[PDB]
Symmetry: none
Subunit: 129 residues, 2 copies
């Protein structure tokens, strides 16, 4: 399969959303990984908005990129504003975890970013047949 | 000032809680540091529960312990279930449940973070008063 690595800063939100959404829309065609430069912890709101869409999240872990330093990926897609890859793509998305307000207000931002990443991934899988 | 290093695995939660709480309850009598063996990033839920208590968090950073090993610490206090500190006078162990291991909604996770905050807060107040 085609290997994709999604990279954000903490591996808590954007790169996790992208990982799960490519797993959904791409199916077995893609071996998908996500990582951050400084791993944190998966944000509960990330899980909430993915689960709202019926997407499973029990396999999600915030992980650092260092143990992957020697790996090669067909695509390394940076989702926040890696040495060895065929293609390096940049898809900047707003950090939903930087939004402030009540849980409901923040969830709205998480949903907006989820839907935007979902749209980009759908178009990207389709433009590859 | 009495020097204290709080040490957990990631420097994201338990050791940051303890640092801020000793800063608060100890005043300027303690030089407080925290570090982790494999540093991550400060957990936003750690920040939230400290801020709910009126405790400032803008100075918090996740950091590795390696630059600190040869430092003189009166106390090196591990709060997770560890380097050799030749210039540490005392080594204490205060195990606490890892709040970052909690799953569930934000409210459910914040409940564990608050429980652990409250326990560390109690231990630090008691320890400051000791002797």
């Amino acid at each position: 399969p085609v290997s994709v690595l999604f990279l954000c800063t903490g591996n808590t939100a954007r790169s996790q959303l992208a990982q799960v959404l490519l797993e959904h829309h791409g199916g077995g065609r893609y071996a998908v990984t996500s990582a951050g430069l400084e791993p944190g912890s998966v944000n509960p709101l990330t899980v909430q908005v993915l689960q709202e869409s019926g997407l499973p999240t029990g396999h999600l872990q915030a992980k650092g990129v260092r143990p992957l330093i020697a790996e090669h990926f067909t695509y390394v897609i940076t989702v926040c504003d890696f040495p060895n890859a065929t293609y390096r793509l940049h898809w900047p998305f707003e950090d939903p975890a930087a939004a402030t307000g009540s849980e409901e207000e923040r969830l709205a931002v998480f949903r907006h970013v989820r839907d935007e990443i979902d749209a980009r991934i759908q178009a990207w899988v389709a433009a590859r047949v």
